[PDB]
Amino acid sequence: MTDRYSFSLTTFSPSGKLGQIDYALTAVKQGVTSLGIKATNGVVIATEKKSSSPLAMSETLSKVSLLTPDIGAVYSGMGPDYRVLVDKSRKVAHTSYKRIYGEYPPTKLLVSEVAKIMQEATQSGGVRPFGVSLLIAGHDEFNGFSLYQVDPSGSYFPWKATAIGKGSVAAKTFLEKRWNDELELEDAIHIALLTLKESVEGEFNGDTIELAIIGDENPDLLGYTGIPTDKGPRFRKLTSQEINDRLEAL
Amino acid sequence: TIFSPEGRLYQVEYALESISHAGTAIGIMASDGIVLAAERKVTSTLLEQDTSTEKLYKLNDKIAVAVAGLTADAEILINTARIHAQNYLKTYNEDIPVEILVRRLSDIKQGYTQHGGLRPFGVSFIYAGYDDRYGYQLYTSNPSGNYTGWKAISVGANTSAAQTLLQMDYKDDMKVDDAIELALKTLSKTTDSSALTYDRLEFATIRKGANDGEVYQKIFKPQEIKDILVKTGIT
Amino acid sequence: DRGVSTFSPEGRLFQVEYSLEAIKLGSTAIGIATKEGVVLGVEKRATSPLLESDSIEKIVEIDRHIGCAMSGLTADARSMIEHARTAAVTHNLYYDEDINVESLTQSVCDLALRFGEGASGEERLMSRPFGVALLIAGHDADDGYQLFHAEPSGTFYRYNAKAIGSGSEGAQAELLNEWHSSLTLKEAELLVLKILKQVMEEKLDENNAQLSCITKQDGFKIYDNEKTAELIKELKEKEAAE
Amino acid sequence: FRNNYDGDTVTFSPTGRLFQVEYALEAIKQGSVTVGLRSNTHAVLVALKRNADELSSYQKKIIKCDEHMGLSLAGLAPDARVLSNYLRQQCNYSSLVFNRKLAVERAGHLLCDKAQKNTQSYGGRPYGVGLLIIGYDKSGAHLLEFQPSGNVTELYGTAIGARSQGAKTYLERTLDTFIKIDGNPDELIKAGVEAISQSLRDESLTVDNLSIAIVGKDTPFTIYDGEAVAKYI
Amino acid sequence: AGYDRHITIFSPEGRLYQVEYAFKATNQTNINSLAVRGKDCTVVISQKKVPDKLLDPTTVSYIFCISRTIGMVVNGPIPDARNAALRAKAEAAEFRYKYGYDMPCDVLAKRMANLSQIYTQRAYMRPLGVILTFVSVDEELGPSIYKTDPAGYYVGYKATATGPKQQEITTNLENHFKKSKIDHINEESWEKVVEFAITHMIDALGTEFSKNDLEVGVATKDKFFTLSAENIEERLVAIAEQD
Amino acid sequence: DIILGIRVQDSVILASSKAVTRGISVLKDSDDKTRQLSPHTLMSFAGEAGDTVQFAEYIQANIQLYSIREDYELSPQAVSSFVRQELAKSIRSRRPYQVNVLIGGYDKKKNKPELYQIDYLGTKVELPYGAHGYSGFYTFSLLDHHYRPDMTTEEGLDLLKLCVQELEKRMPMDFKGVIVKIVDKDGIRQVDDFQAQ
Amino acid sequence: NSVFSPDGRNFQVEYAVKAVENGTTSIGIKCNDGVVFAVEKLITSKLLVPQKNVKIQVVDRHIGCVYSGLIPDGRHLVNRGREEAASFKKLYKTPIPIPAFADRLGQYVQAHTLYNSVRPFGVSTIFGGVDKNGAHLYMLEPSGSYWGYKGAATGKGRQSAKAELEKLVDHHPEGLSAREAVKQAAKIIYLAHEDNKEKDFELEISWCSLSETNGLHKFVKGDLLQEAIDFAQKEIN
């Protein structure tokens, strides 16, 4: 009982590196490839659903998660570390923002918050950094569409497009070639589907690919009618069926 | 937070070592303004430059900081420095004197140096500020919790090369426009890139605001850096 | 390198043993207990001629009937003196009388125990043991004139005579011969001076050695420089004839 | 097997030994000798005090705990103070709350439990003192041996400290003699004094050397020092 | 002795050795377990090994009734198994009180997974040397199997297996659903689903079972119960007269 | 307990009653109900018996500390805001300070005299002239009439003489005269000859 | 302690077991309406007062506990067991069922194997009693592991004792009486003294039988103790 490690487990070495942070990034490296692409009328985040034995139900694992009705997150690295960050992130979006201003936070500020949770694990006593890197995609009235990457150190930066994990280096290259600032959303989805075909070994279909968009408002996904002043959440998880349809014309 | 046989602070020295690898930031102080310039560390074409901030932060309306080190560690310290400024304004109905805020942040750093068994913040700051006691002020703080005031200073990568060049071309009676010029020139020669482009730069000035008698903070837009890069003969 | 309250295979507490070594490196303190009083004497040991010698407080009052001489890391004794003065004053407040010397010493030794890494004591607010030993001398109605040595271990011992500090091995052996149960106060003062003179690195004078005593009738007095210089001038003359 | 396993008390060795507890036990060996013995009407402590110098006190080694109970120490003296202080409070609680004098056996269980906790907590050390506990309660005279490992045992007689084995051997053989010293205090004290001798290369036992304590049927716990122990030399 | 071997900090390869050793620990009892889904039930089977003749065999179980509806089977040493068992009961009761409906199987799995994730991250807590299989007929999802491990990982299964011979039992089941082409055992009675489960345990392990070599838990609509030896014996008799 | 303040053109003047009365006796006829907060800032106070001096002395300590820490004197405006926040905190605590104050200071940066009135609730207001308690019921109207924004210090002292005279005519209690103090560009001085003038 | 070794085991728990194996031998025998407890008391010296250093402990009024290893650890455990029994009674009125009491000790011991700032217990405890549905016997190892037993043994002579117990189990499948288990416990302790015999030893037996003690824990004294010692002394010669 009681914590006896009240000191930082992440300290500077003589060369200036922070060991545990580096190793966290090494953990992220082995992680499955994931990517985000920013269009003019949307953002796409996508990843592979590496099933451990076909007896496992792929749908029951959330690799792409709604954080707020306009913000989503995807990851590379350690799944368990991601799951808790999502919960803490959802809750902090409420306690630090919605319960104060009565509106969901803008993308850059939620990211700022997740980054804080992660930085703290970089410095607090008795803890290791999170072994994940996140890609957070969202829309807010004043900043429009955005995409951010958050790393184990709690550092974050915005991207027009990027990828993280195993086949990241190769995918960043693939995206660099295919990205222009005039892409519709369907184009970005197509580019994302292409980029993700490089990383995957075996089966490549809608039941092995998780993919979500931040697009237009979906009024029928709101749950109620009568306050015409929101046409619903901008976040949408593409269905297994919807993915396969864009694979036939690939 | 332990002492070496020599009398140095191990973790502090190592944090400074960390900073020495971070993108360079420069502060130059004119007679009628202060310049802040900073270089983004080896970036990419797909990195968003528009909605991006990583090296230059607004503390209040009269003070800004240039960051060299761990972006996240700086976000923490930035935000409590923003709070300290607001606490002071509430208590006294006057904006915080630049030094007082700088001392307070430096004290926070000093804490992680003496007690608690937590790692220092791997962050160095350049503070550019104005107040009505001391006019324009340029300050520097590092992991050791030490702070000093400057006419021109640099932090992060290649500070030796940068310091020499600034000592060569700086003189007390400069204008802000020449300080902007000097800032870019110095970074031009201490870069680890081919040349210096607009998308690898953050730029801010604290001027006496054209015509008013009031103080103005300008965080240069991407396109505005591109412009200021042309006139000074770098395109 | 393992812990602060760890046992050696010999059954001693490392930190306690090492603090005693720090006390060996300290300036000499000597105490002689008689039937006319108790004498406390110390070696000032200024590390430079420019140090103002009378700002060296190594003999302190605890109560009117209790005095104290220290040796070792003398800055550690600050809180011990503070605690002793409080315990003595507090006792007078609760009981309208003087604290017994043994009780006062025992209370200081309790303070000395309070060392540990937030140990299964309560709480132990102090990281290391004290780097200082104390000679505690005084008078009470029951047990008369008394001298005590209080180590940072929390153990204390009653002595007829005692020496602590760098010159302690040589000084204690000299105390063994010279002490008899009929020493006058003046005889005792001279012995402290003599023994200090032997073991001190410098030549003994009024600036670098301090004398004090507690009598039942006058309490704890520190001998000022002029009064001690006479006792020196009286020792050299006493030992000229022999 | 002996290397990295003596760091703290929170560590077992591969043999299954707690070395910090064992090293604490060692502090007893290095402590001065003390003796405990009882008949049916009385219990006696005889403790040889040890001087640091020829000019010094022979440190007290007998502490009174209640009117019916008390103990003798060998080892770290300050530890004897912490434990006897705790024992004073427990005897005191039993008196105030229940109007009941605390049974010697319960005092044993209570010391055992206090010492035990220091053999299992990180950042704390075991106690470094052995204690002999005599008392007269509702079931007569009692003697207890306390070991800082937490092990307490009830005995007719025993000895702890330097060369204790001599006195313990003597008492093992004198058993049926001293146990029948009923209603004769001074003869039981004498048997105690003679018991402490079998553990002395040292010398004779002098006036300030010796410390005796007694508790019995109509005898409250009293310590005798110097003048009043001379008649036992 | 490098610290990255003793506490849950990263190794240079971004690994957590304590978690890996916790996985090793889950096999210590040399027991295999498997779970399958019926049309409207869920069945867990585990080997039962009582070596010591001095033991009271009725007290030797690795199957736990967590709530009225949720059952759990553990692979790993018993003390850790009981730790996770008491906690899951606590958590299931607390959920019902605070939220007014029964804690679903998958949510309790997630909650226990998060708890395990914490030991993965904090230095003073060791992981638990266990894998927990949770089963129920959920009022929303139907027959359910969710499994958690010392990494903080959890997922839902059509069927699953755990223990030393995990792989053989898995492929055996994989191969069955490959042919049957459905994601469950198409059987009305839970009795025949148990029978199926035992049958496939036998083929993959190459062993025969008496009534005292097994342990069966069944989960039906609003009840999870374990089988007595004689219930198992009647199941064993029925497989004998066909296979 | 009379606490008066008047801001003329080049200085601020505070007048404060000299009596301290416990129950049926006047215990002192020479009380200085004032603390100097800095070379150019003065505070006058009246209220509940103990709190009165404790609060002033605590405010004084803090300002003196600030001064020495920055080798710089805080402006009247800043000093008064500190004082207000203190009372505003206090009003909602377990046992609030029941003290009303006037702060008169000369702002050397602006070369303007400034008078601040703050009550125990932490109500701050800047005024040409101010008072606390009953005294204002008599003075405010007298000052409404005779006061001019560009009076000399000497003229402000005649305006107060009129105020004190009125208070001595119509107030029920003997407040044993006032101590008058001026705060200008040269600091704080006492006009120790006001009683029989 | 919060440290797995690479084989999945817990080396600090494993070393605790060693301390247990080093201890005095103690046993439990379940009988058809109760449980019997027995222990070997080493006589270090003639000076030990006989019958007066009681090792068996009662919990509540119906539960017995005996242990081998570091005695202080055992006592610490029983003190917790007593608080845990008091707490259950306080809330639920009924005295604590034995399986319930086993898990309370269970979870507590197991907790001391979770953190590096605590060490495991250096005891194996044998305990049991009679609740509202029968007799129960349990043994709890330093790891927190426990199970129900027909018979149980721990300490230096655990093998020879376990063997005897197995012989009893195998040769009395119908059940064993309280009187009988008492005599047999005395036999088994004498037979177990073989592996620790450089010292003389004192026997101690306790029981809790529905008919022989009304379901309460009692020590075996007087006639019934001497009758058992006799039975043992007979079948060792």
Added chain:
Amino acid sequence: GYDRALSIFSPDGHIFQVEYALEAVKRGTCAVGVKGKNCVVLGCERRSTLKLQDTRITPSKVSKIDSHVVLSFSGLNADSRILIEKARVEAQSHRLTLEDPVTVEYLTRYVAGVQQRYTQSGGVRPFGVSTLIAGFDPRDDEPKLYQTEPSGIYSSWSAQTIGRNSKTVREFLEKNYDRKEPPATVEECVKLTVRSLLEVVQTGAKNIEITVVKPDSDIVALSSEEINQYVTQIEQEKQEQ
């Protein structure tokens, strides 16, 4: 709460953390204090790794504690701030409760007290700072100078120095400071202070600063010019065969 003990004893009886704090002090820039017949003078040096500083705003070495007492230091700067603040609070707090400014002895005993406390507390390191504290007791004219070190020891000095090459300047002071006759004036006291610094600093330019304290809260800092006037005089006067 982290309370793992940092300052411990070594076998020879030394607290190494306290020891290495002294090392940090000897590393720090030199400071000297010399007391006259009716004054005390404090002097400091400045380093030379960089020389594009803004001296208008940069923290001077002699700090004001109360209006009559000043403190200078050698060692870690960031540490000295923490001591100075605490000393400033205690100064005010003493005025508030005893209705009297601190004696110089008292302020010293307090700072030395804070330094000691940090040598025996879990999870804290000693101050890499040693100090000179100087001034005049309220309503008193006899000059005071004291020194504290990381251990918590403190004492008074007719003159004293701390920091880098203090060994040499203490060497100088031992030769030239006469106990019988202290530097009878402000002027001849500032002279001995400038001399003693010249051995270590090099050029008496922007590297030597001086501060004078007379009785009744009279504290004046000298300018580059008035210092240069002593620098120029001593170098020319004390050169001859």
Added chain:
Amino acid sequence: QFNPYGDNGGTILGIAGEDFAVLAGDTRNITDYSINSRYEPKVFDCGDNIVMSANGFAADGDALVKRFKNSVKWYHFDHNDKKLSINSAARNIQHLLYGKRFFPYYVHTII
């Protein structure tokens, strides 16, 4: 509402002679108009040749006499068996009483 106090009557008397002293009290203990006891002593030998009576609310009086008896016991422990002088007792009793300044022992106490 609950009243934590009561009144058990009684009267105590202390007279000091040249080389002796007496403390006396009645043995009657009452509540309102009822007699609880005809013999209930309220004057106590406290050891160290001190006699004490704490008359008024008997529950408070008993608590006080208990605590002083115990105070004497610990004086002996902490101060090497020294006799507690009557003046030192009186001072100690002041502190006992004042410990409850804001929820007092409702007794008039004489020693």
